[PDB]
Design an enzyme around this catalytic site. Structure first.
Site, PDB file in Angstrom:
ATOM      1  N   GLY A 168       0.775  -1.236   0.000  1.00 13.95           N
ATOM      2  CA  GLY A 168       0.000   0.000   0.000  1.00 13.95           C
ATOM      3  C   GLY A 168       0.807   1.287   0.000  1.00 13.95           C
ATOM      4  CB  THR A 169      -0.099   4.852   0.514  1.00 15.41           C
ATOM      5  OG1 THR A 169      -0.263   5.303   1.872  1.00 15.41           O
ATOM      6  CG2 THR A 169      -1.449   4.470  -0.095  1.00 15.41           C
ATOM      7  CB  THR A 170       5.103   4.824   2.528  1.00 11.69           C
ATOM      8  OG1 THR A 170       5.796   5.374   3.654  1.00 11.69           O
ATOM      9  CG2 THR A 170       5.181   5.801   1.366  1.00 11.69           C
ATOM     10  CB  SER A 185      -0.626   2.027   5.413  1.00 11.28           C
ATOM     11  OG  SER A 185       0.223   1.568   4.362  1.00 11.28           O
TER      12      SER A 185
END
Lengths: 232, 202, 232, 232, 202, 232
Positions: free
Chosen positions: F23-25, F68
């Site tokens: 996912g996104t950090t 996240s």
């Protein structure tokens, strides 16, 4: 008894997306003067009254949504949003916020993802309305979708136009300015579109109200089109 | 607690009394008793507030849904047969309250329906009224009403029902509200303009 | 514990579709004077009272539908369509709108698509009737179906006539103009059809009512037929 | 957690069918004077009271049915028809209609087909009686069966007689005319049948009532039979 | 609140009184009390409005369904035996209300069934009536009925029962309605025409 | 009807872990002045209103968390932590204790792990609040998470910074000292982050209150960044 992937992604979920990108195409567009949707039915045979091919659904006096995927899980998801919608007006008195409405049925879509014995919804949705003077547009995914577009598209010719818009769009475009936008776009992905194979819904912020568009308004604008198939 | 409904030529007239009546105490000097559920339909509540109160919201929501799911603005005589059903659900139960629904049928014209707490419904072809001070208002109609009257001759007679009842009923008679449903819409009369009438009257 | 496909499509669903394309052929035709249905039972042995092979069902005083697929799942859907319908008529009073009635069982049928442990129905339907002066016709698919034809067909000979009608139908055709249409068509896919192997049910809009056709009217119209097997 | 086929047919369903085509044979014949049934028990060893081999069941004073398939699912379906039959008479007063009784147990059998975890019934049925002066016959299948016969058969030698009957039956044949029909028929499939190996039950429309046939009546009629094994 | 059924030769007749009775107040100047459920059967409500109200609708469906699921138009003495059961279910429960049902059996001919709020059902061979002011209406019939009194001498006698009761019962007596069910159908009389009769009477 | 492993580990859970590191950090950081959160949306196409890409959520007046993993299971946990967050406040009156609130939805998270028919949540959470003058920060895990960090991060650039922080953090660092900490850090993993591709949320402990940072505060701090790409 559903699924999960061996490394990051997720089985069934992505398979059910495909169902959509295969589906009929349909673009939603925001602006500042309201908001309008439109879909490209691909009625081939001409034995089917066009009235039936339900691709766009009203959800409240002020907020409607457009389908793309299987119409199995089209309807059921709307006479249910249409439901989660009036419930809310009822235990408050507020025309239900659009962001909320979205955040509801998109949560439902999300529960259908992670529970035993139930394939997710073969559909993505285009919801637009008037959230108190603010005409806005959302895109749903068969497993949650926090995507509030100024304009987008789903289904068949997604990238076709979902990347046409990618450029020329702008955050001032008016309604009769976005007028063409979708029509021209929709044509790119459908090289030969009947002028009724299509559906237009308008919701002007100028009154918090939802309107239709008659056939041939459709066509008479599908005309500014023969000047687009030239060295481009 | 006092309402009136009557058909006069074109459409239908509805009026109430903005008086909330908490036992001995006058509780509200201006309490709505006239609601517009759909663009072609509207109603008058009489009796147990908090009960009718919900019955309104727990209904409009069922209209502005049926309208959507199937275009046609819930045809009045259909929306009515809900209430007949909605109430009677609570027969086995404690339900209660009065009710008049008055709206224009897409085609069949003007309609006027009366409604008792249990679930009894009747279409009133002529005129009907309900409320603490109903039988007062009634008498007014039953001797001041003709098949034809007029758009005008209705809203006049209309007030003049409340005018009596409102000053001959301990429980009704504070302020007055009025809206008329006709083919093209439903008009809530903003108090100030209502008044004009009995001025031009006697 | 049902199924979903590995790239867009959907397992059990389509497999169940076939079940239909294998069942008996059925034709439905709208118009402007009402609407008429008819089905080609293929009663082989002549030991079976033709009265039992129900292929068509009335669902209200003003709307009925024809079945195609497995009769197991035929009846159950109608002894249950006949049901959602009269419920509606008691929680409103209104002879149930047709687009809704469809939009109900074709909802269940969809529900039987995405839920734990249960096989979708082996059936497509043809629903027609009188929705307040408006006579219309609908096709259902074992999983949601917003297809409101002006006329179509399902079953054994889908493509034979579901692609005959493709041309010579007209948003004008009357009832007795559509008299032959379905008879004549149905023969195409069935070389040699007993007159009585067939059923005919007429719902004129001119009275909101549903009628029957006796045997031999059947035959006497299956006669304009021997002039259709010539160089064509 | 039942099944569905990869191209139209259906798994368990048909497999359950065979079970019947393997079971004991049985013929039911209509007429105009009532209706009569009969079955060829194949009692091999003679240590089993023949009175226990139950193959034909009464269902009401006026209607009864005959079983074919496994005797596990025989009884259960009947001590339950025998229920949905007296239930009706109770919530109406009417001797329950035969096209309704049928369509009932036959609707259940159907549900057993499409539902998670449960094997359809290994039985086809023969149900007949007096529907108000109308003496009729019905055959069921392990998943729905709209087949009202003038006469038919199931089990062992289905095709033996189910295709003997196929010619010489008549929409006129009388009771003592169908007397022999079944008996002779049944003999065709069972070369050498014991005279009580068989069970006879007559419902005359001439009284709305159910009667029994004693052994030897059976035999004395299995007699006009030795003149049938001659160049035919 | 007052209705009447009787068998007279060919078919069966029914009548009511369009008066609704809100305790002291006369509430409806025209309340339907006679309903046709099926092309061959019709019934009459006496008593608890919104209760008998639902039992109508919550029965008509069941008909125009049986009709369908099995051709024969729900034979009357079967449909009746539904109410005996539809009622008795709410015995443990608060149901209530009167009722007369009559219809022309596909074959068995004309039929007439009385019915109480519990579930007691009885086939009446002659004539039966129900409603606040019923015992009035009753005297009439039981000294104005012969085995075989014409298609006419019945609908006459019918009115006359109401004529009496209507004007000798606080609760009945505002306007009148009537229909006669017979083999080939069911006739709802449009007010205006009923009248002719007692004009042609005394 | 979920999983367990053939030697200690645990199927689905870790496959579900991955989904996060995919996912996104996101980075969160404690201290002594409060604590602050920031995430790196990777809004590629500029057609999406950056306002709806929800990546940080408030849970109470004094507590909040950042997502996240997949957002389907983002919301559903928060409008479910948000709930169990006010429930507590109602059955005691106490602004719910951060350690407890965390210990809650993480429990939940766990229970979905050992129960038949349901996939663990594809998400790690960064919860931060003021627990009575004590400002703290937790990391959740798709199956239990007793981790109270002094700073950490999740998602994409997990190792890049969850190993940058590994050194130069100090149990001293201020708010405006942890200012750049997470920005600079965040830059490492995302060579080329737009200055609004990031959200900022500050919860000073000096008022138990949660605040926002405006765009280009974001940028005018992503500037002390060009002096970070030099022989390092």
């Amino acid at each position: 008894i559903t699924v999960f992937s061996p490394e990051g992604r997720l089985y069934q979920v992505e398979y059910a997306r495909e169902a959509v990108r295969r589906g009929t195409t349909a673009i939603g567009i925001a602006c500042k003067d309201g908001v309008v949707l439109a879909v490209d039915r691909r009625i081939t045979s001409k034995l089917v009254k066009i009235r039936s091919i339900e691709k766009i659904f009203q959800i409240d006096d002020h907020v409607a949504a457009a389908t793309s995927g299987l119409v199995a899980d089209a309807r059921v998801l709307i006479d249910r949003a249409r439901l989660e919608a009036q419930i809310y007006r009822l235990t408050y008195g507020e025309e239900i916020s659009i962001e909320m409405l979205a955040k509801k049925i998109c949560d439902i879509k999300q529960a259908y993802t992670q529970h035993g014995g139930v394939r997710p919804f073969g559909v993505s949705l285009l919801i637009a309305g008037i959230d108190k003077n603010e005409a806005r547009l959302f895109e749903t995914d068969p497993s949650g979708a926090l995507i509030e577009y100024k304009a987008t598209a789903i289904g068949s010719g997604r990238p076709v136009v979902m990347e046409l818009l990618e450029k020329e769009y702008r955050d001032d475009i008016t309604l009769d300015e976005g007028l063409e936008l979708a029509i021209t776009a929709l044509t790119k992905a459908n090289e030969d579109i009947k002028p009724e194979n299509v559906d237009v819904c308008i919701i002007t912020v100028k009154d918090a109200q939802f309107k239709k568009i008659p056939v041939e308004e459709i066509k008479k604008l599908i005309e500014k089109v023969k000047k687009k198939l030239n060295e481009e | 607690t006092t309402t009136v409904g009557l058909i006069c030529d074109d459409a239908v007239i509805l009026a109430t009394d903005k008086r909330a009546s908490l036992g001995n105490l006058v509780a509200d000097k201006e309490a709505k008793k006239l609601y517009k559920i759909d663009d072609y339909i509207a109603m008058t509540i009489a009796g147990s507030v908090g009960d009718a109160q919900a019955i309104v919201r727990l209904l409009i929501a069922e209209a502005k849904l049926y309208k959507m799911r199937t275009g046609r603005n819930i045809p009045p005589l259909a929306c009515a047969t809900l209430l007949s059903n909605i109430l009677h659900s609570s027969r086995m139960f404690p339900f209660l309250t009065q009710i008049i629904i008055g709206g224009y049928d897409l085609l069949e014209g003007a309609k006027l329906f009366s409604l008792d707490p249990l679930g009894g419904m009747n279409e009133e072809k002529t005129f009907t009224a309900t409320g603490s001070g109903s039988p007062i208002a009634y008498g007014v109609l039953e001797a001041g009403y003709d098949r034809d009257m007029s758009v005008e001759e209705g809203i006049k007679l209309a007030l003049n029902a409340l005018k009596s009842a409102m000053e001959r009923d301990t429980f009704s008679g504070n302020g007055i509200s009025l809206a008329v449903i006709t083919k093209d819409g439903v008009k809530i009369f903003e108090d100030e303009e209502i008044e004009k009438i009995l001025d031009s009257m006697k």
